[PDB]
Symmetry: D2
Subunit: 416 residues, 4 copies
């Protein structure tokens, strides 16, 4: 089966256009379900995770059309508020329909997500918020059902600033009676994108981007047109690639406000970075300086770039410590990095990376989306040739990484 | 030597006035050093930690007078920028003078804090920010020296949103040339208090309370008058005490915005809480419902109330999990709670509290400020009599806890 | 694709015969490579992991025949000491050929294992021991090569009492010049089985079962006949199944010495256990008492029974804590248990299990061998019907679990 | 108050005699309480912890005399089986009288130890074993009371191979009716010393040193004479001191079997070690090679030498990782090491030590016994002069460290 073959490459040089944010579009697609009417989403990346949630909307009865990076959804006529096991098993982001369906129809029944490679990922805070809004929750044979005679706005505290719980609760609250206050909300840029979209549909959501979100419920929302923000994680991936290959890359169609910790940490590692209104230029250093990273809720360092920074660190000039506070077991890639000659030792949530002279190409497997991309980065700098298996992980969330890296001068090919 | 004796008490009932925030006043006192002139701080709590940092200002040559909750500082004539080991050993908050002294005099030499009971507490991010502003850092025999020909504003990222590093860097940046941007800043209310004070002196500090702080340096700052915010941690202590004793207490002279997670979590445990403009009423439940807490940077649940919530949980109707993400070893109190009949098991940063019928009085020792106060709370509900040693820990940071609890009906006495 | 369907079952009752130990036979099969001659292994379980390592021996040129639980290996004519990526990727136990091949031929080149679901599982201590014996180690494109002009016995310390490193080093040392001393050796019963086999072939290995193993190298080893010990992990699985179903089961063809912590912990949970010379009877209690388990090196509680005890605890009468010290991320099953109505919260290496009234059947996936078996156990007690996917995990290491549970009265079927 | 002043010293050279083991003598002193008669302990180190437990025996009514390294105890006439709070608070090893007093008198009431600097140190497994032997346990106001009409031998499993629980249970079982089996026993050399002593008094204890201990209870024990084993931890301290100072030291009156991991790890770091029947010679290397250490139950690397190895690593030629599995918070010394210019970062139970050129003398505080000794080691190699406070920690458990290091050529003095 299919592999990505990467060879030791030249310093990457040139421009790369960044696609729309996968993790903005997924909750925003779920939000379309809140409107009796037709929404139009532009800048939608052509990605499997997009197609999966689109098929979920079809299941519940919304009409969906995708072309040329525009997705339209007509959620006028919904026929069921049940998300079955087979769909949720494909992608746990499917859970994001629960808030809108609960809000529109006052009842919804959604398969509870199971295990995921990157950790045990409960959805307790989503249910916490729904209960705060008046919903009664019950479990039936793997399904979670939430139902209410009516949703009523209430104050609620998030024990962790969960991205998904903030999204789900904001969407449910959008049609509740009265005012909902989400305390200790996620501040991730996708939260702000979603809020903006809800407001575009007629909602009243204030404070997205800050630690407190206030939603004043409205009776009905209408389909709206929305331009999704750029993918900050994709952008970060290309930035790290410039860093690691001693390249000089201009990443186009980005928002620098959303990249702050990545910019900072790359500068600390010795990159020269030039921030512009819609683009950023990254020049890799001649010697990578070791740095420590600690993943945290935004605007701390993002967990979705942790594997890729760890890969950069495998050849830094010293010792770097990587600490993952956000996900449990987001170190599955370490053993793959070590097969390429890295020197990485883990205990608990910390990985000690002792920089080596160079990596060496080897047969490796992607374990998840972001780690698979880190493996491509290793492949660019590893002596000889690197063959990466289980490539569906990567293709889930990167548009044409082979084409984009090839256009920057890298040696990469997908073989079937 | 001295002990606090607590007996099984009646439900606490009445009003308690909260003092000014210890942890606002300590950085604000250090900030007075930035002005060639006289500042006036009102609402200063009469606490040892206050007196220690005041003696540090005297050491460096500022004039200090304290009376009746007003502290004045005339920092017109400073005579040394060196903070010696003996003073810093007393209280690691002394380190907060480093930023102002560096800013005023472009050189400062401060003993590096050593071990602390509640964890290994490095000051690397403080030095990170000073280096970003142009300071060269060196170590001499336990001292850290920072010096520059001139401080220049720069962008810098905090790997963790450290309270102290945010404070120290904001103060240093206040007199730097140009604009400093602190990314991933602490959002704690004391950060906002400090900022306000600096602005009162003539500074230009914007975004305190948010994840990004921008300071535009000025050439000189002038003494100003400031009213310190209320102690949210003290307030929380009395709130928990109402919860645990099934009491009914009105806590006076507080800011509800600063108490959000404590209010939320207490309501989840079954308290009835009434929030007012300058006061909050807490009615304890008849049965405490078990809840989980997870300490986090503000506005997450505060580490300074963790021991006290754990004490409440020792008699909750079920199993609660307490997770400390902020400090390493902030569980020293667990063994003391267990001597009073609690059922608490720790591994890593998590403590499993399995609620018991009642605690039983016993001889215990305070291990630190906030835990010592938790022990007084246990003492209120523990059958018989509880004797608490090492009480200096408590007296550091609570004004007249014996008098305030006595006025609420509790049985407490300090014996020498 | 294929599923195991389990329904809510009657208390299991009857006798079950236990197969030979998978994890004794795998290193013992690798050990056959040490002899110029034919070995005969009896009591070999008919398992995929067995067939995989047998195909590895074929690759290197040994002759292998399997029938009726007897496997013979003629390692007279070995044709290569290289274990290629495709084989090692299938099963990391393939790494166990490295020690024998190094010992026989003074050179061997083995693909370095990559990621595994249950954690990052380095082989550094294996290489440590080989280096101690005189081997020079190098890495080539994912391969580890060990070579020496001659192996010389030496003392070496294991930083952790690794099962695999003890095995690999014992086998390498068996043909070394002089005496090897393994300090802080694994004490697992499989270590003793392997040692016995090596001694049967002509080796001189003393102290297996204790914290120190001494091997006095010999010039040549000869094929021998060996009876593998019973599978203590399989036995434990059936014991837990009796516990959870309130059953009454006699587990046949076992060694009670190898089951001590499992017996102890099951008695603590309320089982009545009767230990006999070659069998053990387990009667489940009417109410399971909550217990805590902590995985450790033998004779501590085995990690391979951790998931299955956790499953028992999901319906215990209270709160149990499960602590995994041996593997990092051996909690992947928790989310699957929670889909069946369990109440389990994890942080770090500890899982808090808050017992529920009953589990409820649901669609779940096996994540690994031992967890998949735990899911079958849940399926036996869960109201309604449980469907388990990814069943290859289970079939790897249990002989006919469907047939054996069916013979005890359970409702289980494998569907294709 | 009193300080230890250490200066940068010459390579240590010469011989040092090791005293008797503190941690053998403490349980063996408690064991004297089992005999109606007079015991004679030789090779007793002149240490505060010794004097504290001796005063506890006096409290309960045994007659004690200490001179010239011989301690005699006549436990013919015991007058109380209650150990009060004041004594147990001084030293938690006082808890070791519980097993003997329970065994002699079938009732005993012992204050439950509270917090300790190096971690939360429950005694649940001690109580577990006593309950297994027939004792009913209750808590009264900080006391734990154990009482039985008669102690009856039983099998019991230790969830962790606790040193103290193994000791306490072995002593209780020594006079029980029938046979006690301790499964997953501590294998520490002090367990073997204690067993030997009990057997000297007339007991029947087999398997000490192995993972299973069997005690066959006897009706009465008689006073006996015993020679305590050498202090392996003290010996290790002097060994590390040779390593760190590039010295050449012969440590006298030791048992090499008890020092295995320390010898191994020191050789890995580059020491040349010569093991003899009653002595060991350690020659420090010219360049310390970085190594990783992981504390574990014996014969794994001892937690009591962890701080001292960490100190050695502060100037090793690279990166070393120290992992503490045995105690929670046994890293309090890290901040003190960092005040001397070390580069150590902790997360969880792991500390990353990035070796520096040299340490620099500074004012530091001992946090506990073994760390205080590590600070003296740092003081020997740190440029200039190091002043160590809170020296009672050290004096607890080292005989005349100033005199012994002075006799090896070091510059050390205790000032009052
Ligand atoms: C669809 C989408 O946007 N997914 C992203 C979002 O996941 P999410 O699930 O919402 O993230 P969280 O809730 O903030 O989760 C953060 C932490 O909080 C725990 N938690 C979360 C919710 C809850 O109810 N209970 C609870 O305990 C949780 O287990 C985790 O430890 O945020 C993550 C963090 O940045 C991303 O890694 C993730 O990207 C992924 C890879 C991708 O592209 O596929
Ligand atoms: C004077 C004062 O306000 N002290 C308070 C302040 O300490 P601070 O020290 O500033 O808190 P941090 O820097 O946010 O520390 C939080 C975490 O960050 C790590 N860190 C911090 C700084 C740095 O450079 N490097 C670094 O790693 C640090 O080790 C900790 O794990 O904030 C704490 C958290 O709320 C409080 O517990 C603390 O109160 C106390 C008890 C009291 O009243 O005495
Ligand atoms: C073939 C076989 O017998 N496999 C078993 C054996 O694995 P092994 O691999 O030898 O076990 P370890 O080496 O004792 O591993 C224990 C711990 O030690 C770390 N470690 C190990 C080796 C090394 O060089 N470096 C190092 O760090 C390692 O990462 C782990 O955390 O022992 C394990 C523990 O009981 C079992 O779970 C495992 O069964 C399995 C599931 C099955 O049936 O497939
Ligand atoms: C008097 C004496 O010999 N003391 C020593 C002994 O303590 P001990 O207390 O017996 O050691 P453990 O019981 O093996 O403790 C090891 C671990 O096990 C947990 N545990 C222990 C008992 C119990 O019931 N429950 C339980 O959870 C415990 O919390 C720890 O994490 O063994 C330790 C380990 O080697 C030493 O560090 C300690 O030396 C000291 C410093 C000194 O010289 O003062």
């Amino acid at each position: 089966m299919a592999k990505i073959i990467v060879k030791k490459s030249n310093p990457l040089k040139g421009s790369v256009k960044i696609d729309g944010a996968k993790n903005a579009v997924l909750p925003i697609i779920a939000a379309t379900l809140l409107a009796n009417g037709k929404s139009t989403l532009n800048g939608v990346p052509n990605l499997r995770d997009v197609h999966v949630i689109s098929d979920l909307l079809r299941h519940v009865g919304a009409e969906v059309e995708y072309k040329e990076n525009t997705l339209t959804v007509d959620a006028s006529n919904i026929k069921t508020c049940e998300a079955p096991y087979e769909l949720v098993r494909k992608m746990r982001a499917s859970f994001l329909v629960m808030g809108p369906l609960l809000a529109r129809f006052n009842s919804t029944k959604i398969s509870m997500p199971g295990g995921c490679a990157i950790g045990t990922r409960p959805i307790d805070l989503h249910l916490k918020g729904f209960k705060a809004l008046g919903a009664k929750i019950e479990m039936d044979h793997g399904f979670v059902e939430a139902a209410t005679e009516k949703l009523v706005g209430n104050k609620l505290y998030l024990d962790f600033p969960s991205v998904g719980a903030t999204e789900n609760i904001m969407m449910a609250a959008s049609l509740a009676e009265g005012t909902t206050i989400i305390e200790n909300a996620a501040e991730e840029p996708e939260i702000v994108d979603l809020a903006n979209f809800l407001n575009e549909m007629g909602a009243d959501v204030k404070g997205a981007g800050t630690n407190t979100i206030k939603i004043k419920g409205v009776k009905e929302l209408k389909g709206a047109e929305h331009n999704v923000i750029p993918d900050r994680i994709e952008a970060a991936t290309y930035m790290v690639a410039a860093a690691m290959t001693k390249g000089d890359i201009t990443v186009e169609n980005v928002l620098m406000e959303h990249l702050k910790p990545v910019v900072a940490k790359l500068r600390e590692a010795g990159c020269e970075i030039t921030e512009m209104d819609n683009s950023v230029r990254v020049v890799g250093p001649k010697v990578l300086k070791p740095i420590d990273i600690k993943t945290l809720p935004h605007p701390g360092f993002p967990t979705d770039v942790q594997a890729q920074f760890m890969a950069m660190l495998t050849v830094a000039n010293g010792t770097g410590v990587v600490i993952e506070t956000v996900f449990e077991n987001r170190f599955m890639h370490v053993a793959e990095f070590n097969r390429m000659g890295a020197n990485i030792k883990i205990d608990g949530r910390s990985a000690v990376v002792n920089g080596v002279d160079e990596l060496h190409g080897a047969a490796v497997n992607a374990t998840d989306l972001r780690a698979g991309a880190a493996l491509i980065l290793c492949g660019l700098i590893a002596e000889g040739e690197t063959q990466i298996g289980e490539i569906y992980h990567i293709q889930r969330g990167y548009v044409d990484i082979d084409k984009k890296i090839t256009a920057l001068g890298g040696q990469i090919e997908i073989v079937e």
